[PDB]
Write a protein that binds this ligand. Structure first.
Ligand SMILES: Nc1ncnc2c1ncn2[C@@H]1O[C@H](COP(=O)(O)OP(=O)(O)O)[C@@H](O)[C@H]1O
Ligand SMILES: Nc1ncnc2c1ncn2[C@@H]1O[C@H](COP(=O)(O)OP(=O)(O)O)[C@@H](O)[C@H]1O
Ligand SMILES: Nc1ncnc2c1ncn2[C@@H]1O[C@H](COP(=O)(O)OP(=O)(O)O)[C@@H](O)[C@H]1O
Ligand code: BEF
Ligand code: BEF
Ligand SMILES: [K+]
Ligand SMILES: [K+]
Ligand SMILES: [K+]
Ligand SMILES: [Mg+2]
Ligand SMILES: [Mg+2]
Ligand SMILES: [Mg+2]
Lengths: 524, 524, 524
């Protein structure tokens, strides 16, 4: 359709106005004393949230040039959430500071591209300084402190996440889901579990719990559809001679074979339980192979050249206990030589490194947890649904931050680390005066998060900023207690990865937004 | 689409205006002297109701920020109705009081998060005090008093509900349905009944009542579809040799077998009645197994491995008397050893505890009632349809309240228990002054229900509040007769669960609404 | 529908206004100190771009006569992008200059058609002078300089492109795609690779990398669907006697033959791998023949009169190594007499010259690269997506300019070559005074690019134009460092083809736009 074209300063002031609208909505939620934003949903009740990316993803403006400004600055929060899972409000604050100072410098007659180059140079040096400034975060106390800070100063969340990470291991996974009570609870599963139950309730030998319990059984992994009992006769007779239970994990069992099995189980001839093979497609094949490796058996498949009639006891795995419920099957203490498990998890790590989508990566990580580590689930308790959503979002933030802090280390929080870095980079210069101005723009914008944190508390940002800049080390300001001290000693920790990611994404988007001259959009 | 964004006090005043609209509509119906609200329905005549959640679910406003406020406060009443079945007007009153005082405290420069923490601490202590303050409610007189109070001071409803609870027992169920006369009537069913009638009117041997009566029958429980009589000759021959009637509960009976049975019945050879198996799917299997357990028989099914031709007299259950009508079949005084019945009902209560949806839980409760207790039905009598609906809603409120009062106990009603609790918590303090202000906010808000009850009567709420606060024990105000006295002696009882749930949900939602700073919604 | 008709000067002023809107939007991005334009997209975030054709393709206006002017001048940028891949902003600037001067001359009472003839004569002479003025660009240093200049003064892009062209060769191809990191990387493939992997994971003999590696195998090129192994035995028996592996490239393999192959490979009988034939249809046939030519084998097809059962060792090709992954197949150091390779690539060049669409030509070039040269891929690294898109467009511009500079040579850049040409053509005259005025119009318009480049830097265009015109040789003005000097030694190079194309297309469209007298469009 027809277009509207704006040139120079008109375009820049419209763009800055849109940036300011979105940033002012987002920034009221930063720090221990930030507040909540109520978001109207077309289908349902409003959501009350303190998360930056959630607020940013809803903002759209009536004016089209201001809407372009807002849509451009939204990508910083989106990208920070995608990369680190936390630190989106800080990224937005930094982006707005850089855009404001850069537009001020441009209006004074500077070349925008040289300013952009200076900003890039300053941010590169800053990232190197941050990497030099970090310390490892390995003990459980520091992990508790990180989880507490990221969950808006909630000690119970930090303690629960530290316990979960200690119990599940370095190779395990932790998930968050809705609870049923009013208190948070942690349930950890050891061994392998897949969401497949028995195919016939008559298999139950322990009606007290409604569960099928087998001690030291055989596992027959059938990679095929079984409908006719004629195929299973040899293995069933062999196991009956053996005198110990059997478990069938197959693609499916039809009416005739299932009927024969249930008739035989209740007569006392054989103890047989049958469940479905988990997954659909290639992943189903992979997880059958994984169970074979864990249990020390061989998968019976037509695509390799073996028939189920010719199966012997050597193709059957073994375990110590098998417990089957209506929904989940667990295999406990299965026999398998370790080298096979380490080799399999090694291969899975290589296709982990060669994975693009996050869904595939998380499925592979869940497989590694099943084979080697554990799986923990945290249930969130709340009285209502809005409270449940808000608490669940906080818990997910804490979990992401603990992961990042483990994988890269921690720096002093509260905006102090960026101030220390900018103090260290005070003697950096570029090629021309515009580049030096851009370096100064970046270094000045590096103090915005602390100033906004102090504003949200109702204090004076510049007095606190001067007092913190006058100190050295981990000296900082505690906004929860309104006192100065050691950031590390009072437990205000930030992961290095979150700070670095926020700085990088903010600089990347703002440097481009500084260099605009014309804006082309549709008509009202 | 494009959005509208409001910051700070403007957002808070719009939100409070919406809260006030909804709360002022709901609160006029509180107490013995509350009034009715007329709700327009697009399809039909208007509904005249005195229930809080029914009024709350109807309100929607033109302005979008006020609509956000109303939509958020509606969840308190929704959740209270879902949890306790009663006490939603009290929850709405408490939520409005907390929101009003909290916004007043926020406008004075307090930190909303510390106020929220103080409110949480106060409510936790209050719930503990309420638990300490209750007394058991086990006799029939107290249950009658609770049912009377919850039905808007209607003696007959309380007496009827107490009689039903006495006749049916602890393990039975009671339902409410529309009547045909002008008087309430109670019909209680003893034994097991399912809604399946005879498959052929020719089976009727007693045309005076149009009913099929069999004495000491056999019950053949066939878990299969019978169409050819050839499968079934042996059991008919054996029963004919036995000389006493037979009952066939099967999936269905086709024309040929039904014709053979009906021909045989009218010649005096065998007394046979045929009915359909209740339910559809797995629940039908469970019901057939329940009848087998009650009657001491064996279900004939192909999936476990017996054929109906090989059935003997041991697979047939026994009873004392069977009466079949056009719609219902009843089995009275079945012959079966008790231990099977207790085992089955225990099993069922274990999968009751592991049930998520209320529909599944109430189906299992129906099954337990059929196996062990009884089923009662209360028909409501009224001249018109609007009166019928209003009375039926009152009766449902009364029945829910009696259940809650049995399961947790009673406290003194009229808003007196909350006043006693707030008097007890007068020395509670937090960590900083903001939290102390929040504690005071919660304690002040606990007096709102009594004040609104007195205001609905046309009296002075503050004079009555002062007089009641000056007393001790169960001293309170009777708003029906405008007299002070002992709450327990005059029979104004409230379940503990209703009070506790109202307090918890109101606090949970209001604490979050206090901490708002920005609102984002669509443009007009 | 109904039309609007405008005559003469009214039409011309509306047309010039539209031309000016489009040109003024496009021209802000010209030179080393041009800026970016933000383009709104209906689906997605805005795009920030510095490319002339991208900006031009977006402009549409409200007035229909101005819209006709804009839509007419848009074809210059479109055609320059189609022809050379670069120089669209320069073409637009030249077109606007010619149109403005020509309309001024027409308003003075000149014949438009003689002006058009004079403009054509001047442009023909200018193209001849440009061809005489060039020097070859063959060394890698000049290639790096061209790539650097065309990428907006980015040294790394030029160095990477020079390395890629050095490693791949004259007959190879280079492609640009999105990266994953923050740094640019170059990956070059030697030999032939096609993008189908193995047909069964059981073929993998090296689980460490998940790759199938075969040493000196045979290649059986079957242009047939293999489903029954009966057709296939003799060649497997022959190669089992031979004792060295085999590779099957076929249209596809069904379950039976694949099962036989996999069950044989794992038993140590024969080492067999099966992959799909690349392409769909005739191109599949052509690249199958190409693999036959490279590996020294014969394609087994029914359309020529041979059957796969009668195949012998002569029909099987040979190689040195074969590496198959999940996605790509790699054939390294295949045995084949060179004369066949040169014959095949020469033939492919003959149908290259006889190709119309660009898609067919680029597919042909890919096949030439696979048979003779190499294939390189450049991944672009950036922190966000807008930055990635902007950098990727810059890299593509650089790659196109480097190709053009290879194929035609370089001239002095910065607008200096056009000034030298126009200085040389100062004595050119036509047939009548109108044609002389047209020649002068073209010569004056030839100085517009330098003036706009100097204007975008904040300097005075006329002072710099006079100073550069007063010089000789490659003497020019460096707008990056604001210094005068020699273009060649400071490395500001432009391809001859880009300059010539811009001049030709701009003159072609502007000359026709000059001769307008009436405009007919729809009604508002
Ligand atoms: N008690 C405290 N004193 C000072 N700074 C704090 C305190 N608690 C948290 N912070 C800082 O506030 C920031 C938390 O902001 P947050 O709302 O989590 O936004 P983001 O999405 O950027 O993480 C962190 O950078 C943290 O260092
Ligand atoms: N005679 C009475 N005197 C004082 N209070 C009463 C009397 N009867 C009922 N109430 C109180 O009125 C409240 C009932 O209000 P109601 O309209 O049922 O609202 P809700 O939905 O909260 O139950 C109860 O808290 C009860 O204690
Ligand atoms: N440092 C420089 N000094 C002077 N002229 C330059 C310099 N760098 C590039 N140029 C000139 O600027 C022009 C580049 O404009 P550009 O934005 O690439 O538009 P186009 O799409 O027409 O190539 C080229 O003609 C080049 O000769
Ligand atoms: F309004 Be409540 F349900 F008594
Ligand atoms: F804008 Be052109 F493609 F350099
Ligand atoms: K936040
Ligand atoms: K009410
Ligand atoms: K350009
Ligand atoms: Mg955070
Ligand atoms: Mg009630
Ligand atoms: Mg270019």
């Amino acid at each position: 359709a027809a277009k509207d074209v704006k040139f120079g300063n008109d375009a820049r002031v419209k763009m800055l106005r849109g940036v300011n609208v979105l940033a002012d909505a987002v920034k009221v939620t930063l720090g221990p004393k930030g507040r909540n934003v109520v978001l109207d949903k077309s289908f349902g009740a409003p959501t009350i949230t303190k998360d930056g990316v959630s607020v940013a993803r809803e903002i759209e403006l009536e004016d089209k040039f201001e809407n372009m400004g807002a849509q451009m600055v939204k990508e910083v929060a989106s990208k920070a959430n995608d990369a680190a899972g936390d630190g989106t409000t800080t990224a937005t604050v930094l982006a707005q500071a850089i855009i404001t100072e850069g537009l001020k410098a441009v209006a004074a007659g500077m070349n925008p591209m040289d300013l952009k180059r200076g900003i890039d140079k300053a941010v590169t040096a800053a990232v190197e300084e941050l990497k030099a400034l970090s310390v490892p975060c390995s003990d459980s106390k520091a992990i508790a402190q990180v989880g507490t800070i990221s969950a808006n100063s909630d000690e119970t969340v930090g303690k629960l996440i530290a316990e979960a990470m200690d119990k599940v291991g370095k190779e395990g996974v932790i998930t968050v889901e809705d609870g049923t009570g009013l208190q948070d609870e942690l349930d950890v599963v050891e061994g392998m579990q897949f969401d497949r139950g028995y195919l016939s309730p008559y298999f139950i030998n322990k009606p007290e719990t409604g569960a099928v319990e087998l001690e030291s059984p055989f596992i027959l992994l059938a990679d095929k559809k079984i409908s006719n009992i004629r195929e299973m006769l040899p293995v069933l007779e062999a196991v009956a001679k053996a005198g110990k239970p059997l478990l069938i994990i197959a693609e499916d069992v039809e009416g005739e074979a299932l009927a024969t099995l249930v008739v035989n189980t209740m007569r006392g001839i054989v103890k047989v339980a049958a469940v479905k093979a988990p997954g659909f497609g290639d992943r189903r094949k992979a997880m059958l192979q994984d169970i074979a490796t864990l249990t020390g058996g061989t998968v019976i498949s037509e695509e390799i050249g073996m028939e189920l009639e010719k199966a012997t006891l050597e193709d059957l795995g073994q375990a110590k206990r098998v417990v089957i419920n209506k929904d989940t099957t667990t295999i406990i203490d299965g026999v398998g030589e370790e080298a096979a498990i380490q080799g399999r998890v090694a291969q899975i790590r290589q296709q982990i490194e060669e994975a693009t989508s996050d869904y595939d990566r998380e499925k592979l990580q869940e497989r590694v947890a099943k084979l080697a580590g554990g799986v923990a689930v945290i249930k969130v308790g709340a009285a209502t649904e809005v409270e449940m959503k808000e608490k669940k979002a906080r818990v997910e933030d804490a979990l992401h931050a603990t992961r990042a802090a483990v994988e890269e280390g921690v720096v002093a929080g509260g905006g102090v680390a960026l101030i220390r870095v900018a103090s260290k980079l005070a003697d950096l210069r570029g090629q021309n005066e515009d580049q030096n101005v851009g370096i100064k723009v970046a270094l000045r914008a590096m103090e915005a998060p602390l100033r906004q944190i102090v504003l949200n508390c109702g204090e004076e940002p510049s007095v606190v900023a001067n007092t913190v800049k006058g100190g050295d080390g981990n000296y900082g300001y505690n906004a929860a207690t309104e006192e100065y001290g050691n950031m590390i000693d009072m437990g205000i920790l930030d992961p290095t990865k979150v700070t670095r990611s926020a700085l990088q994404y903010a600089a990347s988007v703002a440097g481009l937004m500084i260099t605009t001259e014309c804006m082309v959009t549709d008509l009202p």
